[PDB]
C-alpha cells in the first residue's frame, strides 16, 4: 500500500492548466514545463530517444493532454496517374477500383479530378498543363460514363484527406495521406502544411450570404451531377451538417432546375443531385488565406487553409 | 493627426479627409501672406505654424538614439532642419525676433563603412554584403542567448558616427517650444551657378 | 491566454472625476440634408391600389446625417424656433415633474389642461406632436413603432419614447450617474454611411445630452437666399424677421465659421 | 486544456436574481464567442428569442448549431463563470431541468430551444436589463417527438385534435408545450426540404411492399395495422393493380436507403450530446459532445 | 541556364577533365553549363547586394505606476482575487447640526474586471524547444525558438499591463459625470434648500446655459486674443475645485511634487494635441518628476483572518485593529495607510502643473494606445 | 490511459474457439474493470431474434475488441473514440475488406450458429458499409418477397426473387447470402418486424405526401420547389382521397413520422468504424470509432 | 514579395516606429511589407 | 519509422562507372511459340454474327 502511493505519484499530476506568472522576462522553469510539448522526431541515439520520450506508452512522456496523434493512409499509385509537381497539402480522393485484388490504388487531386469531368466536353489551362493526356486517367475509372449516368459516382469515390509525403519514385508512387487527425508534415525539419484547394473550385459559403462566431469552421467537399458532366466544388462553412444540407440545397437551387429542364429524369436513378461530405474542421478566424500555385509555365489562384484537422465523413446526398 | 486615422480608413473617413485637405488648402496655405496682413500678432502666428509643421513630422527615425548634431552654445539635440528660400529667410528671422544660437556642432567627416575580409568573401562568392559582420557574429555565434537591449545595441546602430570629431557648423538656430531646429537657406549655392533653386 | 482580475472600489462619497469636452476634431456627420424614407422603416405598409403605391414609391425616390419630419401648422411662432427648445412643441422638462412617479409626469408631458412649462400663456406650439395620440408619436413613439425595421435610428425618437422620459423621472443624482455609467440609451453609430443603432458596449465611444435634456439647438435656417447673404454681410444688425421670410441664428454648442466668399461670421 | 469562461456582468445583481440563477447551476448555456472573458450580451438564447409573443424555433436551432455550448458552474455577484463544451473532452452534465425527463442509461442527449415557455426556463436580470434564457436539454427520442409535434402543428394549422397534438406525453408526466402560429420563412424552408423528401419518397417507393400490406391487412391484424381500421387505403388499390418485379424493386431500394440517411440528417438540427453512465441517484451523467 | 560566374577563388586540381569535353558538351552531358568564349571568358566583375542592417522596436514595458494615472488610484497586490466573491465598504458619516442628529450609513461595493488576451504559439517552437540541440545550426534555431516564446510571453504580460491601464481609464470614465453638470452641482448655492421642484428647474436651466457657453473651452481660447493663459487657468481651476476630493485616503502621503511637501491632489488625462497645447498655454510647468510608490501595497491573509475565511468566508480588512477594539485621526492614520507607506519614493517622469494651491499632474496616454493600433 | 476490461469466467475446445477470434469485437454491459459473464456480447438479445432491438443494444452499449483468452479470464480492451485500434476480419460470413472504407457493425443476420462461440458469447457482424446497406436491402426485400409468395404464390416466383437476392456484388467480390427459405409467417423470424415497419411507412407515405403538399402550397411562395416537384410523381397518387378523419389522419401522420425516424436512424448503418490501412496479408485493419 | 522572413540579429532601437502603423500599412505606404499574425509570427527555420 | 538522408553528388566530369554483363546464368523465358491473342488484348472487338 506504500508502493500504491508511488504508483499514484507516477499517475496523478496532469499538465498545469493554470500557472501564476509574475513577469514574462524571467521565463521560469515552471512555465517552461507548461509550454513544452514533447516532440515526435529525434536523432538515433539513446540520449535523444530518452530525451524526446518516444518510447512512452500511448502518449509521449520523458523519463492525454488533449492532443491526438494523426493516422497515416499509405497509398500506392502509378507514377503516370499523379503529378509529382503537386503541392504537399492537397486533398486527394481514392477511387474504389472494381477488381477484387488490386495492390495499386487510384487517387485523384481536384486538378486531376477536373480532367475526368472535362473530356467528353485559368483552372482548366493549369489542369491540362499538368496532366497531358486524360486517357491515362480516364481508364483508372473503367466505366466512367455508366457510373456518371446512373448517378453512382459519389459512393465509389471516398475522400482521403490531404497529402503529406510524396516520394518521387519512377513507376509506382507511394504517397502518404492523413485520413484522420491533426494534419502535420513528417519532415525532419518539422514544417507546417497548408491544405490547398484551387480557387475556382472553392466557393465560400459564409461570405456568399454576406454574429456568433464559432471556432471550428468545417470544409465541405461537394460532388454534384450536371448536364455538363459532374463537378467537384468545395465549401467552407461555420455551421452544422443540418445547416449545410439546407444551405447547399439553397445554393444549388438554380442548378437542379437547370439539369431538370435540359434533361427529364426518365428513370428512377437520375434523381440524386450528388452528395456532400465533411472533410474536417479548422479555425474560423485565420482560415483560407489566399495564395498562388506556380507550375513551370502558368499560375492559378488557390486557397490555402492552414492548420487543418482532417476528418472525413460519409456521403450525405443533396437532392 | 491620429484622431481620424485610428478607426481604420472606411469610406466615411476619406470623405472627411479630402474635405479637410480642401479646408486646410483654402485657409492655412501661404502662411507668409496672412502673416503680413495680420497686424500685431505676426510672431505668435508664425511661431504657431512652424511648430504645427514640426510636430506633424514623424520623428521616429531609427538612428535618433544616436546623439549627433547638437547645438554648440546650449548642448541640446537639434532635431530638425528648415530649408527655406533666401527672401523668406530674413522674414523668418525678423518675425521670430532673433536666433537662439549661432552655430551647431556636428561630424567633421563622413562615417567610414568599407568592406572587411568576411564581407569581401560574402561579396565575392554570394554577392551579398551585410552592414556590421562583427555584430552579426556577436549576436549569433558569440552570444545568441544574450538578447539585445537598446543600450546594448546603441553602439551597433551607430556605425562610427558617434566617434567622429565635433566642429562647429554655422547655421541659424531657432527655438520651437521644447525643440530646436536649424533654419538654413542655401540659395546662395545655386545663384552663383544659375541652377534652379 | 493570460487571465487577470482587478477589483476597484470608490473611496469618496460624491463624484471624483469630470470629463469635459475641450476641442472639436472634425464634425464627422456632414451636417446636411438627408431624409430617411418611411418606406425603408415601415416596409409592410402600403396603399390600396398596387400601381398607385408603385407610382408614389417611384416618384419620391424611395429606392450623411439622417433628418426627420415633425409636421406642424404654419402658425407656429418663429420666436419659439429661435430659442433652443424641444422640437415637439412642448417643454419636456422632467424635474418640474416629481420624482419616481407617473401621474404628474404624464400631466406635464402630455396633458394640456395645464399650460406650457416655459410659457405661462399657451399649451404648446403644435398640437400635432405634443398629444397622446398625435402625429409625432404615431411616427416615432415606440409603442406604435412595432414591427419596424430595427437599426435605422430615427433621431426624433429620442424626444418621444416614454421609457426614456420615465428614466428621466427618477432622482437627479441617480439620473446623472446612470447616464455616465450606462451609455446604452439606444444611440446612433460612430463611423457609418447611414446612422444605425449600436448594440455593443465598450467598443464605440459616444455620449448624448439629448437623451439627458430633450432639447435641440437650431441651425442656420433661412427662408430665402437674400437673408443668408445679408446675414453674412452685417452681423449685429441683420434682420431676424423680414416681411414673410425669416432667418434663425445658431446657438449651437459648437461654433462654425461660415466661409462665404470672404465674408466669415463668428 | 483550460476551459473556463468568466462572464463579467456590467452591473451588480440582487439577491433574488442570485438565488434564482443559483438553482440553475449545471444547466447548459450557449455563448457568443469562445474566448476567455465575455460580456453578458450574447449569452443565452435570449438574443434570438426576444421578449415578444412570436417565437421561431428553427432560428433558435440555427443559432444553437452556430454558437458554442457551455455549462453553468459558478455564479457570483457582478460575474458568473462558465465551462465550455469543446468536442474531445468528457463532461459531467447534471439533470437540473424543471420539466423532468428521465434520462436513459447511455442514451443520447439533445439540446433544444425552450419549448415549455419563455417564463419557465429563464432568469430575469433587470440589473443588466437583459434576459438569460436556458435551452432545454432532453433525451433524443423525446426531442424527436417534440420536433415532429411542432412540425405537425405547423402543417395542420390550415386544417382545424389540438390537445392530441399540442401536448407531449412521457412516462414521468405528460407536458404541454408552447405552440406558435407561423415559423416564418425558415420553418417553411425546413418543411420545403422535407416536402421535397416526402414527394420524392412517393415517387420512388416500391410496390411489392404495398402488395404485402394489402393482403396482410386482409390476413393479419396488428398494432402496426390497427390505425388503418381494417380499411386498405385506395392508393394501395390503385397502385397494386400492376405486377411485381424484383429488379425494379432493388433499383428502387438503392435510392430509398440512399435518401433515408439524408432524411435522418434532416432531423439533426441542434447539437447532439452522447451520454454514458447516467446515475438516477445523483442526476448527473458522464457525457461528451457528438 | 542555372549557373552563376562570380570571381571565385578556384581550387586548382590536376585532373584530366579537359579530355573529350566540347564533343560531350554539345550532346548534353551536363544539365546546365554556360560556355564563355572570347572576351567574356574572364573573372567577372564583383557585384553585390547590400543589406544595410536590420532593425526592430524595443517594446518598452509600461508599468502601471510608471505613469501618473496611478496618482488617481491606491493599489494593493491582493494575491487571491479569484477567491474574493465580494468587497464592501461601510461609511458612517456623522452630520453635525446648527442651533438656530443624523448619520448617513452608506455602502459602496467593489466590482471585478476580468481581462485576458490570447497569445498564440505554434507547435513547431515547442517541439524544437523541449528537445536538445546538438549541431550549431540547431542551436541557432533553438535560440530563435526560445526568443520567440519569451517574446510572446513578455508580449502577453505587456498586453495585460496595458489592459490594466485601459480598465482603469474606463472605470474612471464610468463614474465621471461631465463638466457642465458638476460646475453647478458642486456650487453649494443650489443644494442649500433640499432639492425641491423650482430649484431643480433652475438647475436644468443652468445646465443648458453652461452647455453652450462653457463647453469646448480650448476652442474658445483661440479668439480671446492674449488672454488665453488666464482663461485656461480660470477654467481648469474651477474644474479642479468642482471635484469633491473628500476621500478617506486623502490624508496619507501617496504622491508628492518631487521637490517638497506639496501633495498632487488630482491628475489630468488629455490627448496628444491637448497636451501639446496646454504645455504652451500654461507655458513652462513646475517640474518634470513626481515622487510616488515603486510597488504596490500588500494584503495577505493571516491565521486570525484565515480561520474566519475557512469558517464562513467574510474576511476582515484589518483584524488586528478590530482585536484592538478611543481613537482619533492621528491614532487611526496607520489603520487606513494599510501598506501605502514605506515605499521607497521613486520619481516618476510625468508632467505636473500648478493651479493655484493645487499641484495637479497632467499626462497623455496616446503614446500607450497608439502602439496598440486602437482608438483612444 | 488504462483501457483494459478483465472479464472473469474454460477448456481446450473453448480455448481453441476463442483463440481463433482474438481480433474480433463484441459489446459489453459497462465500461468498468471487472465484469460477469452475462454482460458480454449479444447474449441476452439473440437466443427470439429481432433486428431493431438488437441494433438498439448494439448502438446503446459500448464496444470492445478482445485481445487474449485464458483458461478462466478474457482480457479485453474497450474501444473509446479517443485513440486508434487494430481489428481483424475473422467472421464466418467472410467479406474481404479494403483500405479507407468505413466499417460497420450490424447484429448477426446470417445465423446464430455462424457467429457465436458455445461455451454465452455472440459476436456481432463486422463488414464494410456498402456491403452492409446492400445486404440490408437484400434481406428486407427478401422478407417482403417471401411473405407475398407465402400469401399469394402467383404474385412472384421463388426463382425470380433468388437470382438477385441470393448474391451481393461489391468491387468484383461476388458474395452469397444465407437466406431462410422457410421463414414462417406471422413474424417470428429475424427481420420479421423491420419489413413490417417498411411496409407501414411505404403505405402511409402517400397520405403524408398529399396533406403535406396541400398544406404548403397555400404558403404562397417560399421557394419554387414546393410546387416544382409536384410534377414528378404520378397523378394517380396526387388526387387520392383528400377527405379523412383529422384525428385519424393525425395519428397516421404521427405513426409514420416515428416509424420514419426510427427506420431512418436504423438505415444509418450504426456505430461506424473508419479504417485506414487494411492489409490482407496480415488480415489486420487500423481503425477507430467514428 | 522581396521581404525575407529569415531569422536575424534584430538590432533593437527605441524609436516609436509603430505610430499609426497598421492603418498606414493596410493602405500601403510601404512598397513591400508582410504581416505575420499568430503562428507565423516566429523566426523561420534555417 | 527511422529516416536517413544521403546526398550523393558527382565530382568527375565524364562517366565514372561502367557495367558490363559477364555471363549468363539462365534463360527464364522459353524461346518458344506462344503468341498472344487479340481476344485478350482487344476484348471489346467482335464480329456481326
Numbering used by the authors:
A (entry chain e): 9 to 71, 82 to 139, 150 to 238, 256 to 364
B (entry chain x): 199 to 395
C (entry chain W): 1087 to 1149, 1179 to 1381
D (entry chain f): 1 to 160, 172 to 301
E (entry chain W): 5 to 104, 113 to 337, 345 to 395
F (entry chain g): 1 to 9, 13 to 50, 54 to 125, 131 to 301
G (entry chain S): 5 to 50
H (entry chain T): 1087 to 1135
Question: Which text from the study accompanies this structure?
Answer:
Epstein-Bar virus (EBV), a member of the subfamily gammaherpesviruses that also includes the Kaposi Sarcoma-associated herpesvirus (KSHV),2,3 is the first identified oncovirus. Similar to other members of the family herpesviridae, EBV has a characteristic three-layer configuration: the outer lipid bilayer envelope containing viral glycoproteins responsible for host recognizing and membrane fusion, the inner pseudo-icosahedral nucleocapsid enclosing a 172-kb double-strand DNA (dsDNA) genome and the middle pleomorphic tegument compartment fulfilled with 20–40 different viral proteins. All herpesvirus capsid shell consists of 4 abundant proteins: the major capsid proteins (MCP) constituting the basic capsid skeleton through forming 150 hexons and 11 pentons, the small capsid proteins (SCP) binding to the tops of hexon MCPs or both hexon and penton MCPs, and the Tri1 and Tri2 forming the heterotrimeric triplexes to plug the large holes on the capsid floor. Once the viral dsDNA genome enters the procapsid shell through the portal that is located at a unique 5-fold vertex of the icosahedral capsid, the viral nucleocapsid is joined by the capsid-associated tegument complexes (CATCs).
We also determined the high-resolution structure of the CATC in portal-proximal penton vertices where the CATC binds exclusively to a specific one of the five registers. In order to do so, we performed focused 3D classification of the portal-proximal penton-vertex sub-particles (extracted from the C1 capsid) with a mask encompassing a region containing only one CATC. We finally obtained 93,334 (83.3%) CATC-binding portal-proximal penton vertex sub-particles. Through 3D refinement, we obtained reconstruction of the C1 CATC-binding portal-proximal penton vertex at 4.3 Å. The structure of CATC in the portal-proximal penton vertex is essentially identical to that in the portal vertex. Unlike its counterpart in KSHV that interacts with only one MCP,22 the head domain of BVRF1 simultaneously contacts two neighboring penton MCPs, mainly through the region of residues 291–314. As such, pORF64 (the BVRF1 homolog in KSHV) interacts with one penton MCP at the apex, whereas the head domain of EBV BVRF1 simultaneously contacts two neighboring MCPs at the middle of the MCP tower region. Each CATC binds both triplexes Ta and Tc. The interactions between the CATC and Ta are exclusively mediated by BGLF1. The interactions between the CATC and triplex Tc occur at the vertex-distal end of the CATC.
